[PDB]
């Protein structure tokens, strides 16, 4: 059955009638290009606790 | 003569007026996370044999 596939000559280790491939492709983890994210501007304060000192 | 004597006094505790203003952690970018790796992809296919007419 054709299966709506593409025509591929199979000289390299592919007997006649061989199938395979996939229309759906999944990006593997190691395929992700290196990139850097920017951290936005930040600002904070800490409250201070003190009962007193003699 | 008047003998030496102590003025019996003590210090009442008070909480210091102290506050902490704003600050930024200073970081602006993350660390690179990713490697550029070759990733295998194959479209659906069927394999035949080609013959050229002599």
Author numbering:
A (entry chain M): 218 to 271
B (entry chain O): 326 to 379
What does the article say, verbatim?
A-1(L) is a Myoviridae cyanophage isolated in 1970s9 that specifically infects the model cyanobacterium Anabaena sp. PCC 7120. Using cryo-electron microscopy (cryo-EM), we solved the structure of A-1(L) tail machine, which consists of three parts: a 205-Å-long neck, a 1045-Å-long contractile tail with a complicated baseplate, and six pairs of tail fibers. The dodecameric gp2 portal, the pentadecameric gp5 and the hexameric gp7 sequentially constitute the neck of A-1(L), to which five neck fibers are attached. The long and contractile tail of A-1(L) contains 24 rings of gp10 hexamers that form the tube, surrounded by the sheath of 24 helically stacked gp9 hexamers.
Each LTF subunit contains a shoulder and an arm domain, whereas each STF subunit consists of four domains: β-ring, joint, stem and cell wall binding domain (CBD). In contrast, the 180-Å-long arm domain (residues Pro156-Val379) of LTF is folded back and lies along the groove on the sheath. The overall folded conformation of these two types of tail fibers suggested a state of A-1(L) in prior of attachment to the surface of host cell. Structural analysis showed that the arm domain of LTF and the CBD domain of STF most likely possess the binding motifs that recognize the host receptors. Further competition binding assays showed that the arm domain of LTF and the stem-CBD domain of STF could simultaneously bind to the surface of host cells. Altogether, it suggested that the STF/gp33 and LTF/gp34 are indeed RBPs, which recognize and bind to different receptors on the host cell surface.
